[PDB]
Design a protein around this nucleic acid. Sequence first.
RNA 1: AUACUUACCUGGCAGGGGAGAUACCAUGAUCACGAAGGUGGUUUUCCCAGGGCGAGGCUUAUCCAUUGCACUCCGGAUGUGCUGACCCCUGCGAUUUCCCCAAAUGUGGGAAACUCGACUGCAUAAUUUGUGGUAGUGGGGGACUGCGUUCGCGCUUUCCCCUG
Lengths: 81, 278, 74, 81, 73, 95, 50, 201, 86, 77
Amino acid sequence: IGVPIKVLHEAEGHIVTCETNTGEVYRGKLIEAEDNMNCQMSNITVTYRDGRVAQLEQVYIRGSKIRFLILPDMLKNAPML
Amino acid sequence: RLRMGEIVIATPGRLIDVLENRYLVLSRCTYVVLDEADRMIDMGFEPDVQKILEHMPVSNQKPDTDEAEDPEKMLANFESGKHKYRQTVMFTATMPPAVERLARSYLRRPAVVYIGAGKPHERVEQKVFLMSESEKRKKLLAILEQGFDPPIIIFVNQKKGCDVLAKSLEKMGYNACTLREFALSNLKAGAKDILVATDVIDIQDVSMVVNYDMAKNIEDYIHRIGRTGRAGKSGVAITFLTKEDSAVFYELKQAILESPVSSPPELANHPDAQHKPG
Amino acid sequence: SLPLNPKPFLNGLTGKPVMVKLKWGMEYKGYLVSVDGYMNMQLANTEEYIDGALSGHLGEVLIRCNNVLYIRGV
Amino acid sequence: KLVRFLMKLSHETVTIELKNGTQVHGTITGVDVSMNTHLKAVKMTLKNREPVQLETLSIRGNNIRYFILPDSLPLDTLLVD
Amino acid sequence: AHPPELKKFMDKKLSLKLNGGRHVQGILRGFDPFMNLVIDECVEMATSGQQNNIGMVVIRGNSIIMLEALERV
Amino acid sequence: EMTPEELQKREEEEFNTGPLSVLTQSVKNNTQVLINCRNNKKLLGRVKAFDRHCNMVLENVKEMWTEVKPVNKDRYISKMFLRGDSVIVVLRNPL
Amino acid sequence: PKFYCDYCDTYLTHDSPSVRKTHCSGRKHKENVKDYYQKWMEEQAQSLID
Amino acid sequence: TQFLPPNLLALFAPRDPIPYLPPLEKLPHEKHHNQPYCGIAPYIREFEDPRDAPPPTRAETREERMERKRREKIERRQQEVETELKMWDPHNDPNAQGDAFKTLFVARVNYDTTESKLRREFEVYGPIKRIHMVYSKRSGKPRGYAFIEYEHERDMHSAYKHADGKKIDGRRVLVDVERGRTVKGWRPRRLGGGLGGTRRG
Amino acid sequence: SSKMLQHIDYRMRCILQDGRIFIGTFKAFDKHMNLILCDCDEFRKIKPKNSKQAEREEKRVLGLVLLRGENLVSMTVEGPPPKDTG
Amino acid sequence: MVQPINLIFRYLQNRSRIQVWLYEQVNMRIEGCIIGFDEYMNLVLDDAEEIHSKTKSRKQLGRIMLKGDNITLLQSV
RNA sequence: AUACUUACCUGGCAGGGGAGAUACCAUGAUCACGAAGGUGGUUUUCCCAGGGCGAGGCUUAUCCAUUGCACUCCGGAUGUGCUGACCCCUGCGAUUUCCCCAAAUGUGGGAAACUCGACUGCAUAAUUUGUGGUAGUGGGGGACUGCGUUCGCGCUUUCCCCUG
Ligand SMILES: [Zn+2]
């Protein structure tokens, strides 16, 4: 497994922002990530394309449909890096 | 195999992981068996066995009333086919408190069936020789030279021992097998006269077992000497004891003192046989 | 009919005139000659139909499999 | 495999067109098996933008539409392995 | 080729964002390592406010962007 | 695979008989070839080599496309490598 | 693809989702992690020493 | 990082959520395609073939000069052998005498073995009319082989059955019948024939 | 892979498929070209319909970013590693 | 768990009339009876027709193989 | 921590430059002096891949020297980043046994044993990244429509230009 995916798994349990291909943005607690970058998240503030926001309880996102994630800065101090 | 779809046999650690990942469900389980529940407890499996129970559907458990052991009602429930209450069976050799905890949770008004040949040490003639390790090979040879009734079994602790001891005997002009079915046939047939083996099937009664290396616990020792047979000729188990075996002396001493078919002050009076180990 | 599946369906169609429709709206008509395990298609006497009606006559054509939406007889 | 060929083009100066209209002119330092491509002495010209000169550029290979090769590049020689 | 972790959402009512700006909602009866889904008692959620019921249905994993649990897992 | 053993010049059979024969024969006989490409331009040229993906090395290509009234455009490119994914359709020169 | 735990300095010769989760919810592992970030707080003492 | 003391786990805190900004590109299904993908029918300018190049250009490099060279050596070789072949006639060789059918062929001899030791070893099977050991007409070094003509065919047959592999002066010898003058179509090893397989590959 | 390693821990400007630029300290990559960028800033060019007027560049700070390889186009070196000598 | 491959098989057996939503194409759908299919989710459809949102008019196709990449959803009647 | 034992979870396979050429050596080639070649060396030419050595040069600042008359660059020192000829090496970073060279416990040469750095190939171009629904069908400046209008614009039809 690649270093960057490890880093994704290390942010399991914390707050991540995640932009999807569609342009929505999901901010919340990352519960569990898989190696494909499928992500389950809780307590999200979705931000739709237009700017309007919403609250969602439990969400799961296909890895193939993610642009990028914003992880907690502390992760930069994980051992490899 | 899981993908294919009546009975699952499992170990606790493996089963909980599978349930936890939903590789398998207990939706139509109507039969629960805990085999050697005391050994499960000894291994530290109580919490895992608890957690496994938590995945069984609660609504198929029998009611906790006198009806759970009413034969007319419970028989009618058995015959009720698909919709009967679950039934649970626990097998165990002992009932320490943890096992009784399992029973209180898993079972409802269970019947107990207690049965009771099972204790080879009482009925197998046992002899010991205290020596240093370097003395073992010559004492074995001296014993073999006295002659024996083939086949016999010689036990050793490590598989390399097995192979090298076996070579030496074939060197001394002995017919020796190492340790599948092929080996036992020859022995049974008379071809091979000596089986060398480690604590690792099914084999005829033997006149003699030699513990070239003493077992590391008394349960393995008991199983070994049990190879002289369940009954009939007592047979003989000869054990070479060294100072490296001191942690089994106390239990070995007990095994022999409880054997009316056995005569050993060398062990019985030994400083290391006086108190339980650890 | 049995369960008639894609590979043997096309193997049926090979030799016969067929029409293939691409994801991008054009369609190609002609004698299906060959196909592979990725379902690339070779056509012969191929003609191009843009937006439903005939555009022109082409020739021997390879169609890269990713481009194809559906394929159908005559 | 025909990337095998592209991997031989080190030190050759090429022009690459990207699936997004960007044109890259540069000298190939290396190509890898996924067609990812590294260049040096680069003039990148994003679609309808003024050129920009760069010491170095790497391109994820899926983005390449084509390589335009030197007029003189000895193809037959290079295609024998 | 590891399967996706959708045990959590099994037999739950979901709302799914799909490829073409299409949204659909229903009860998750199963899945594949491609993340192909089986939804049950599924409702179309057409762009017009209108909803339509087509029950049992297969969704290709490829075309699923995000799913939200309505019954909170 | 269908051929899980690593003796699979079954590709070489598939190139000779299968649909990529269009290329194998074009390369063989030095025939022109017209490719409709996913930048929506059309490349007419010769095929010096190709692979499974339809990666092609081309020579003497004329790239032709169409801008805005609609104006035709063209450019000569003497040696290129085209990435296979960007092929829609290849057409061998009829005559 | 064969998995290396940077915290434990050990390998999982055959990685799976199940295996890596088992490892990561392991006694040895969790201790090594705790240690790693305690050791990082020691890095902060190396600030005041300046 | 997951189940740590809340002491340390407060380090893994998010930064503030990022300002909204609208998307850059439209969604792919809702983009307006001003010149959508289009076909190639308009484009059969091609070129009329009476100005088309002929096919064959391509082929070997150093790979062609190499292949040609092996090919020629082989052919050159076959012609050499053909030519020798028609010089070869053991019925007209002054060395080959007497009854071929009473003649034994012995090879793999030690170069040190004398004609005496050999006559001794093979006399056991019967009286020998003649021994001819073979020497290089160039060096005069022994070739390791001889013809032994017996008085009687029977005795030759006997040596043939019993002497093969016989050890003489440390070396197992090979024993056969003379074939040069008996076997239809025989050629020796130097002419591309021969028996034995020490150097098949 | 040294072609990528050698720029590791530099400040690198990455062009994404939608035309965003990520500039960030280049901490890690993989066979996909998934990236890890530190102190990553996103920039983007906004066209003026209002007048034939200068472009807006719009910065937005992201911090520690994991970029999915699929969305990467190109990357060039922006600057040297933030430096530990004075 | 009902699993998506089986549910397609169910559709096959029933000879249920299936409507397919398409991938990145929102104006057209396709409907027909699933005669057969494969590992890639390519479908053989027996009486297929192509259905457009604006027209409410249906183009008849006959027997078709529809490549998997296109499918976004499978529906009944 | 180490070694083993049991249980549970897991489990692809294959490899180590390539292709030519070698007149010479070994293989002392079974037919009257001889195969050719093949195989193993040796030498060498291509395809070249990773290391060694760093001559020279590029860039910028501290200190030191310099008040100098040129028109052929061109004082010294020290340090961050670079580029890099000639000439070498052949594959790699760790372990175990045997044989020999021997300045003989050193320092070498020849074999294997199968061992990790997720090295590479592969039913890997078929839904989650490495063979496309991210195509690349403009922005602006003047002439030149109507409709709504809050007169700022939104939609819509053109012409001529600038420009990516
Ligand atoms: Zn660990």
